[PDB]
Structures are given as structure tokens and as C-alpha cells.
Nucleic acid binder design. Sequence first.
RNA 1: AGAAUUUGGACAAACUUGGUCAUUUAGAGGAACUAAAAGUCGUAACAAGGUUUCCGUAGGUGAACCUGCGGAAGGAUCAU
RNA 2: UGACCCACUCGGCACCUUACGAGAAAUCAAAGUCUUUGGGUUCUGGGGGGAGUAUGGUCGCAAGGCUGAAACUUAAAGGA
RNA 3: AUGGUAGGAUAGUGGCCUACCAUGGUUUCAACGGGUAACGGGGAAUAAGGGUUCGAUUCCGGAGAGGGAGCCUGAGAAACGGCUACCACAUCCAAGGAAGGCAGCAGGCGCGCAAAUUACCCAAUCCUAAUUCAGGGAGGUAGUGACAAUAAAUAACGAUACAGGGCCCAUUCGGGUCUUGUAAUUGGAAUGAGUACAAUGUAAAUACCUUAACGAGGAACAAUUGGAGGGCAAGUCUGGUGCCAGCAGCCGCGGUAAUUCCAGCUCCAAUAGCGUAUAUUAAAGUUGUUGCAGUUAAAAAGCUCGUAGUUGAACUUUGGG
Lengths: 142, 55, 179
Amino acid sequence: GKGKPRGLNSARKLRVHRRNNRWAENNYKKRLLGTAFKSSPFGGSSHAKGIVLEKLGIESKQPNSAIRKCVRVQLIKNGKKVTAFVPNAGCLNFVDENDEVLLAGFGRKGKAKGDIPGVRFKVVKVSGVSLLALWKEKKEKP
Amino acid sequence: SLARAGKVKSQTPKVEKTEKPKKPKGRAYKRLLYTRRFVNVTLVNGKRRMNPGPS
Amino acid sequence: PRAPRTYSKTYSTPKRPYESSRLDAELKLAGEFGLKNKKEIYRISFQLSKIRRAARDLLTRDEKDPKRLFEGNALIRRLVRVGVLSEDKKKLDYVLALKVEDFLERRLQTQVYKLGLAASVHHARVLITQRHIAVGKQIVNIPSFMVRLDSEKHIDFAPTSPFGGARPGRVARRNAARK
RNA sequence: AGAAUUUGGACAAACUUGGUCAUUUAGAGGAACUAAAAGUCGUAACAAGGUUUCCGUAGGUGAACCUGCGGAAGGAUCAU
RNA sequence: UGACCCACUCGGCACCUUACGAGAAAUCAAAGUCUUUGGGUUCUGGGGGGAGUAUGGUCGCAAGGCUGAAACUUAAAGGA
RNA sequence: AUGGUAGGAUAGUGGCCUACCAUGGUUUCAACGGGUAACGGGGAAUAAGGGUUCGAUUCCGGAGAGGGAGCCUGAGAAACGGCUACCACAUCCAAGGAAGGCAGCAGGCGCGCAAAUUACCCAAUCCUAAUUCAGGGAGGUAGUGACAAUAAAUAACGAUACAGGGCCCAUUCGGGUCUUGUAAUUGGAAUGAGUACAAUGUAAAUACCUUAACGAGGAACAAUUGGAGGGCAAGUCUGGUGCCAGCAGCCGCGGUAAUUCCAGCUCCAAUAGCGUAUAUUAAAGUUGUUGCAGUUAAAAAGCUCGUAGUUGAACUUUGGG
């Protein structure tokens, strides 16, 4: 006689005692307050527009040393101030201050990647022309 | 520091793509693959290293 | 607005992606049967996986119930017409013991090969894309066709075609216009 | 026919005032948090860690922490 | 009659022994009948911290409880 | 607020609004409230099944016309290329007074990561007339255009100077006769990318398709972008530097012979296209119904009662003809 009511008329007490439970399970937490719209940068999104400030330097977390390349942004929305991260080379160079940049996630949700600490985004485009190209030289910049 | 921005991909031996008798590109990448993966054997020392690094 | 026109993909990919398991049985397929891309091994795979349940579905009606027989005897005769399964096997039952590999022989791609009129499997194909082969007096330009058993004997070469008629064929309006 | 105007009405622009949600953001000052190459005073824990650790509570305590009650064993015993 | 012995049983409170099974293992008659995946239903968790704090809302006379963030930071923290 | 009864109201119905009346209607099967960086859907990405996100945007609805209101015409508007005001904008001025709404095409400004010519036509496509004939930045079509997508050139074939990888003989050369090949002499053939008569096309041209004339020898008519420890294809090559420059998505290199940095040669991968950052997907059986975990890894409530919720023993014509 495990812990649940079982007979026939035990609809009522079931549609409640899952709907309570669900709570805790983290996911169903995000989706009811859902956080996504109020908290976090993109709100209910995937991508966005921003414009750079400084070119900050963030060393490592440690089993590592690794002085990586990050940029503060200004979005073109809530305004948060965010940092974000660059790929490939130096990549830095090609992000010349107060330029237009196109930001996206980091495929991890929330969370925070690899050897970087409070950091949660990547730089996809600039000006809107790739980075991918303004490192495999299929275009160049204005 | 930002200095060392790029440092490596400066000092890269530039080096070139090399020209070729190109690779055929479709059906025909099947008749070509097939022949290698295993129809002449190919090699019989246990099994087949797909791409051996010169010993 | 208008009747929004209706369409299902045929493909159903795999559940695990990579495997030196199942992989090195596609490349044993392509290959042996012509084909091209993996977007064939997986078309079929779908359409067998399609039929397969309409059996499962039945079997679980009783036997004898109207629906079960009708489809079976309608289901079956759809596969007798395409050569797929024999005469002698059709109880129902049994269509289940049909692996990928039976269907492939009844693709025009290869039925040409067997009707040799083709050096290897290849010379079996350009031969279809190039308007060359023909069922009635009618061209077909697509490897995946599926041989309807009672045609088969009517498989050509057409009037149009260069290998049975209307003219020599381009490269010949050249060896006769430089001596 | 019937213009200006005009009675009272319903419509309700507007604006002033409060009064409030709801986002913002200032700020003498406090209180924490975390990141750092090697600054301090200690040695609490991991061995029976030299008083065996731990919980919940209550009061102490330059600081780690120490002491009462009752638990627990993750114990240093599954033993008359 | 009663204590007793034994035979049997139903209900306990445990224990030994196997492992056909399960498991990361240590071990487990249940942690078994689970990729051959489904008897009934209530709670909970989804990296480590920040922190069960700040906040609001509430129960208490108070100690305090129940509710319960985020920014920030981090490539491990952990189990056997 | 919810109904009754009657009237006004409308093109009508109805608390639409008012006379009087009754006290109802919604609510844990989530109402009312707060949020939405929400216009809805058709559908788009993803694609084994089940799924997760995005649909301001080529069609169907609705909503605005700088905010707000009110109404003149007409069947047909609460119209904004129609008017009154009001307010927030901002234009002319002889300062008396006038006049004004690109979120129609264009265009400039501002904003900002972020997106194009004040160009040519009613010839198609269709609509407006009183109407065959006007007119129609609706539409079309050029310009700019790497958003994507389709096709696919950038060199072929000789022969040679050797090297060969075979073979027929090797009593020792080595030739040889079927073959790829490093070549820094090679010579005949082949084309269009560009240029350009004509025809074409075009309302009118550009282009395309055609084609006379032209046009391929390497110093051209020259193909790039990203790596070459691992993940993960491929340099224990040379040069410089010495925990400093710098690289490195993560593990990590660098403190005097660096397979990582700067750079030379060399090779590897995509290739007219590569990278880079962001968001989303699969990967994710790390949100899970199909398919999770809860003895100690993060998790069984302190234990029991309970109104909802949810499940609920079996038995009511089978068999035979």
C-alpha cells in the first residue's frame, strides 16, 4: 500500500498531489514566474542587438592560467552590463570600440562555460558581417 | 593584458594550399569509397587503420 | 487563403548518429546497388517501417474480422504488384520477413543492370538520367521508380533514344562534319 | 427658406490636483559576499588529528571555536 | 488445566545463506520483477558555491520557523 | 455587478441605457490581478520515433494613422493623402494673421550592431470610372545587393631529359614495352571571363541566349579563408623569444634546443566562399508521456488524519448450427 491513494474516486486528490510535487522539478520552476520574461538578458529570446563599451581581460578558474578575451555591452533593449566572450585567434581586433555587435548564447542555458567564471555569452557578428569571415577572410569591415 | 592578442596566428608558417586531380562528387564518391573501405582485402594485419601515420 | 496543400517528408533518420557497426552496412549497400546519398537507405528504411506496423496493427485484430482481411487482401496485393514478396509467402504474417534488401532489386536503377543493357550497375544509372531507357513507349528520368511486376518485360531504349533509332547522338554530328 | 447667435442638455476632449501601483535610480553611512603568489595571528577538521567527529537548540568566545542538554554514527565496537 | 516438548500454521520484531536477479560499487529478499523500458498514486533534485542569505508575504510574546530570490563568481565539488 | 418587467436607443437583438424591482454571477478543474522584448494563424527552422523553439515579414483576419475625442457625407467611414476642436510636435509671415500629419513611394535626418536608387513605364497584372480611348510609385521593371539559394570556370592532352612501378632474359650487365610518375628546355591543339559589329530581347534599354571580329604561356587572365599537442584531419621541420610578448572555446603551451606564441618553408580542411560572435535547436534519456534520478552522489516531507485531485476485485449470450 505505497504512499498514494490508489481506489476509484481518488480522481481529485491526484491532479493535485502531481501539480504540487511538480514545483521543486527545476524546469516546470523557470516556466511559471516565466523568470526567461523578467530576469536574465534576452528575456524571452534568442539573439541580440548590442554596442560595445572597454575590451576587458579575464584570467582563467583553476586547474588552468589563461588571460581570455571578453567585451562589455548595451543591449538595444533593457540597456544591462553583461560581459561576453570572443572566438579563434586575435578576433579581438575586429571589435573596435562602440561598434555594433550581434550576441547569442553559450548552448548552456543560464549557465556558465568551461574555464571562465560570471560569464555567459558569445560574439557571433560585428557591424553584422559574421567574425567567422572577419577570421577566414571572406569579407572585411566598413 | 590584451597585448598578447593573436600572437600565434602572427607567426604562422604562412604555408600553401597545394593543387589537384580533384575528388569526384556524388553517386561517385560511392564507386570510389567502396573500393578502398575493401575489395582487393586492402590489408590483413588484424584489422584496418583507416589512415596510418608513417611509422 | 485556398486548401493548404498537404505533405509528408519520407525520411526517418537514425536514433544514434555515429558505428565501424552499421556504417561499413551502407557503404555494404550504396555501392554494390548503384545509389548516392544516405538519404536513400533512408527513404526505403521508412517505407518498410511504414508497412511493418499495418501488419503489427492487425495480426492483435480476431483473425477473420472484416478490416483485417478487407486490408490484407488489397495491403498484400499491392506488393505482389511491385516482385517485392513472392506468389507461393503471402499469408499476411510472413509480409514482417522483408528486409531492406529485397526492395532494392525492384528499383529500376539496378532492374536494368539485370535485361543486361548496361556494363555495370553506373552504366546502369547515367543510362536513366540521360533519357535513354522506357516502359510502354514511355521515358522514365529517375532511378527510384519501383518495378511494377507486370510491366519488367516491357523495359527498354526508345525511339526519341540514340541507342535504338532516332539519330546517332551529338558526338557522332561532329565525326561526320570532320572526315 | 432661414445665418449669427442661443436654452438646457447627453457627449466628452482636455488640463490641475491629489492618490496610488508598477518599473527606474540617486545617496552621509553601514553590513556582507566573492576573486588575488607568495601579508597576519592562530591549528578547528582529515590518523584515537592528540578532548573522537556531526545535528538541533542556548548562552558564551581576539578567531578558528569552547561548554550544557538530548540525539545520531557517516565511530575508534555489527562480540558473554 | 498450567508450565513444558514437538507438529502445524496466520501476524509480527529481526538474522542467516545464496545469487537466478539488481547495482558505480560497498552491498540489497528487497535497492529484485527496468532499454525485454508502463500494477496504483503524494512529495522532492537537476553542476559547485553566493545561501536557506536579501527580500517581500506570513505564523510566534520573543527566540524563530515555513515560504524563498538574483547579481556575481567557478571547472570542478562529489560517490564508492 | 446578475436576472425580471416596460419603455427609450439601434438598421437591429441585449443592463446597450434608464425607470422601478429581486440578490444574484466568477473562483484551486486557477477566476480576478502582474508580466509579455504578444498582433493572430496559415506555416519556418529542427528533421527516428514522441519532440523543442520561432512565426514584426509575400496569402487570410484584426488594429492604426502624432495623441485623444466628436461628426459632415454617403449604401458603405468614427475615415486621417476627410474636417472641427483639444494637447503634444513643427512650418510660414509685412506679426494683422494664415497653413500643416512618410508607419503610400522615394529619398534624408535621427536611433543605433542592424538594412538599398529624390531613377524608367501602363507594355503585362489588375482596379476606377460617365466609361474600349484616360489615370493608376496598386503595380511592374531596371539601379544598389555576397540575405539566402540554384548551378559551375581557374587549365588540358602530347612528347621528351631522366627516376621508376612491371616484365620477356638475368653465364653478372641491365635493358625493356606494359606502365605510373619527378619535370625549372617542352610543342601542336580547346575555350570564355572579358572586350564587341549585328540580329535578337526590350514599352524603352541593360543582361541572358546567339554569334563576325578579337581574347591563355606562369612575371598569367595569378583562388581565398582557417588550422596544422589533444579533442580532430595534418610538421617532434627551420628560424627569432626566454612564465616576457603573445596564443588557448576546455585541457593547456611559454621560466635557452617551444610538435601551440611572431614569422619562413612545408603540408591539412572547406572551398567563391570561409570564419567570428549571439540567440536557438539536435546532441539532451542533463526535463523525461515514450525515457531519467531520489541507501550514501543534489533529492522520501517528522508522522498520521483528511476536502478536491487521481485511481478503483468480479458478475449480467456464451457456445454451437
